[PDB]
């Protein structure tokens, strides 16, 4: 118990430490990108220990370590959830991010703002691990909006370009359309189950869950670029190749899929929500893979590839296989 929770919080605090280093600076750096790459590699190594001792016993816990705010019946706490989804996704995300940053030390070498770029990429990683480890909907919304804003700042990296700013504002627009449904779901759970924590949502086990699941499906449509709210992910290729490689292929865009996987005890008892996810995912994975057949920009083709795979993930959530969908994320 004392090993697991300690190294769990060490991973997150260790990822936050180069943000304090880049904000508390005076000098021109002795290779700050190597520092952030070494930091994320060691955070991967540190996060492998709770993963392995999850593989040994299935050991899950919840670190509700800081009481934040009690709104009369809603005790909001800094509450981290170390279950199967965190224990598998956090090493995969850290490993991919370590590869993207050692790639970025080569690719972004001519950029005179490389420290700002590594700062932003690490801020994305911090907000994504706030998203995937959260226990209440407020903290998951913090990570949700955080990866959205780092998506904005990293699409619109070369900000003298009109199309980069246009693509970034487009990504913000579609993700706020998803945020309509996310805040719908938060409103439903607060008014009907008196909670944002996942535990009380799972334990009360509501039956009339059509409207909060429609809100979660709208949030996943915005975040995982499903049909109707898809084109921001092909527009998002206007950012640099480490941004499209880390965020908009593998790590950010699975957060809506991860949101619907995270609510699997509610989607497993709602056939209408499963049919909506199934039809929406099949529509998206048809449409984007059909669009990819005739494109000529290589990053557009791989962006339609990753949106077709997200549509496949939404399909396999829709057939009541959330763990195969999460396995397909990690794969």
């Amino acid at each position: 118990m004392n090993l697991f929770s300690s190294l769990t919080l060490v991973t997150l605090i260790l990822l936050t430490m180069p943000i304090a280093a880049i904000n508390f600076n005076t000098h021109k750096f002795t290779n700050y990108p190597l520092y952030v790459k070494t930091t994320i590699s060691c955070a991967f190594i540190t996060s492998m220990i709770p993963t392995m001792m999850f593989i040994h016993t299935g050991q899950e816990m919840i670190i509700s370590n800081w009481h934040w705010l009690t709104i009369q019946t809603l005790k909001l706490s800094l509450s981290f959830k170390m279950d199967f989804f965190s224990m598998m996704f956090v090493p995969v995300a850290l490993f991919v991010t370590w590869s993207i940053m050692e790639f970025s030390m080569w690719y972004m070498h001519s950029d005179p703002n490389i420290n700002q770029f590594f700062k932003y990429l690490l801020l994305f990683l911090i907000t994504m691990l706030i998203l995937v480890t959260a226990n209440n909907l407020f903290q998951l919304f913090i990570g949700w909006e955080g990866v959205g804003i780092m998506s904005f700042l990293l699409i619109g990296w070369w900000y003298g370009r009109t199309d980069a700013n246009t693509a970034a504002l487009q990504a913000i627009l579609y993700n706020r359309i998803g945020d309509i449904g996310f805040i719908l779901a938060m409103a439903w759970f607060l008014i009907n189950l008196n909670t944002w924590d996942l535990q009380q949502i799972f334990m009360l086990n509501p039956n009339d869950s059509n409207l909060p699941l429609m809100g979660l499906i709208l949030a996943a449509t915005g975040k995982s670029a499903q049909f109707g709210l898809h084109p921001w992910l092909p527009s998002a290729m206007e950012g640099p190749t480490p941004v499209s490689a880390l965020l908009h292929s593998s790590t950010m865009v699975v957060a809506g899929i991860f949101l619907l996987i995270r609510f699997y005890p509610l989607t497993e008892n709602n056939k209408f929500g499963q049919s909506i996810m199934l039809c929406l995912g099949a529509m998206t994975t048809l449409f984007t893979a059909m669009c990819a057949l005739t494109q000529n920009d290589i990053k557009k083709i791989i962006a339609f590839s990753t949106s077709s795979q997200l549509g496949l993930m939404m399909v396999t959530i829709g057939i009541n296989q959330p763990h195969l969908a999460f396995l397909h994320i990690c794969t």
């Binding site: 009109t162 504002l169 309509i180 439903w188």
Partner: protein, 459 residues
């Protein structure tokens, strides 16, 4: 509350006896000392308000507005000392005296135990604000803006005077502490309908209500920077404060008097936000965004649930800091390009990177990025309005699209793109300006660590 009134009055001999190079430094120093002293008002209790005397009291609603009011004066002195550098010395002291007088009127507006003294201070705040707009505003339309700011407010407030004197003659008192215990239910009659309108329409104008907001995109625009800071950050919030004091007496008629006005805000925050998509004037965009944000506070006060009042007072404090910082950013560009047209100076992140970081932070707080208290107030209002009626999330969520879409457009048009070629007087960011941006943004970010102090009397 006399331990804050007397230092604010001693700011008058402090500014009228200072040396001619010293009247900004001394007033800034001692107004920061008054703002440090303001934290003693956080002696709040879970049941009893901090009741000082027969005349003054402070609950957990008035206390954050008092701290924000006493904090806003040094920031206004920093914002306003550049464009009044060539000003005459005695007119400079008159400007500082009007700001000091406005702080004095506000800090005993929020702590007025009795409601007609609340009214006298509430309408006493017009005169320094009117004089600041019409005397130190820059353009021709400051006079018309002063006329609109005066005459929407008085046409709203004089029926409030009649209604408060009626409550005095009927209930026997206008002590709020007495009226917590002697409040009688207000039944359905036409007499009580106009009682409700006379008690509410003054604060509806001061919030502003959509449809009555027309004074604001002149009064916030034609004012100087200290005028825009105090109008956006404090003087709109007198309406919400007075509504939260006056809707105690207006039950249960409010439960069917609120229906038009709720519509006027729930559609109006869609309209004014949409108006911010097509504003060419940056300062007018910030004004219409202030109307858009205060419409949620109007809805949250009219639906009168605990989550709604908590989100409304959080959103009032958060919008005070955010809109004050946005006007200071707009002034920091106006002091360079001498035009409030937003399309004129573009690409400013290439020229001013740290100031563009401040633009980014104030934009993110404008679009309610969690866990900022902008998002806390926004979110609690959305929760309470969903519990009010489930359909309202549409008008909430659509609002949260457009609120993003003008906040980053303001970030993209001013800071991103190619810089303007023919503009070459873009000086580097002064230390006073970055100090001003940090003294707005750093309390707004530190309040996310302990938001319970800005969540009103029923946290």
């Amino acid at each position: 509350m006399l331990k804050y009134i007397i230092p604010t009055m001693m700011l008058m001999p402090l500014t009228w006896l200072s040396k001619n190079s010293m009247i900004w430094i001394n007033t800034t120093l001692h107004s920061l000392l008054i703002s440090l002293t303001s934290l003693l008002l956080l002696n709040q209790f879970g049941d009893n308000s901090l009741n000082f005397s027969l005349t003054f009291f402070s609950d957990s609603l008035s206390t954050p507005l008092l701290i924000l009011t006493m904090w806003l004066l040094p920031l206004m002195l920093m914002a306003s000392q550049h464009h009044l550098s060539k000003e005459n010395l005695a007119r400079k002291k008159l400007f500082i005296s009007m700001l000091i007088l406005l702080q004095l009127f506000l800090i005993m507006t929020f702590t007025a135990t009795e409601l007609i003294f609340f009214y006298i201070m509430f309408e006493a705040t017009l005169v320094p604000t009117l004089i600041i707009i019409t005397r130190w505003g820059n353009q021709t339309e400051r006079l018309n803006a002063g006329l609109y700011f005066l005459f929407y407010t008085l046409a709203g407030s004089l029926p409030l005077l009649v209604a408060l004197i009626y409550i005095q003659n009927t209930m026997g008192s206008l002590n709020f502490l007495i009226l917590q215990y002697w409040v009688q239910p207000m039944p359905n009659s036409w007499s009580n309908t106009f009682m409700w309108l006379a008690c509410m329409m003054a604060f509806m104008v001061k919030m502003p209500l959509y449809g009555l907001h027309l004074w604001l995109p002149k009064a916030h625009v034609e004012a100087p920077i200290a005028g825009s800071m105090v109008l956006a950050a404090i003087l709109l919030k007198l309406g919400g404060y007075g509504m939260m004091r006056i809707t105690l007496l207006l039950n249960p008629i409010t439960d069917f008097m609120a229906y038009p006005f709720i519509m006027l805000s729930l559609w109006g925050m869609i309209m004014t936000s949409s108006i911010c998509l097509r504003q060419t004037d940056l300062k007018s965009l910030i004004a219409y965004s202030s109307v858009s944000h205060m419409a949620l506070v109007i809805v949250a006060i009219l639906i009168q649930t605990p989550w709604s009042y908590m989100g409304a007072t959080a959103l009032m404090i958060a919008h005070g800091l955010t809109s004050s910082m946005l006007f200071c950013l707009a002034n920091s560009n106006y002091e360079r390009v001498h035009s409030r047209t937003m399309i004129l100076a573009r690409g400013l992140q290439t020229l001013l990177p740290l100031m563009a970081a401040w633009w980014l932070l104030a934009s993110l707080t404008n679009l309610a990025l969690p866990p900022s208290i902008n998002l806390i107030g926004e979110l609690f209002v959305v929760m309470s309005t969903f519990s009010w009626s489930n359909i309202t999330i549409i008008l909430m969520g659509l609002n949260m699209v457009i609120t993003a879409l003008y906040s980053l457009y303001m970030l993209i048009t001013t800071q991103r793109g190619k810089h303007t070629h023919h503009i070459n007087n873009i000086l580097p960011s002064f230390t006073r300006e970055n100090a001003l941006m940090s003294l707005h943004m750093l309390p707004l970010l530190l309040l996310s660590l302990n938001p319970k102090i800005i969540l009103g009397p029923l946290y």
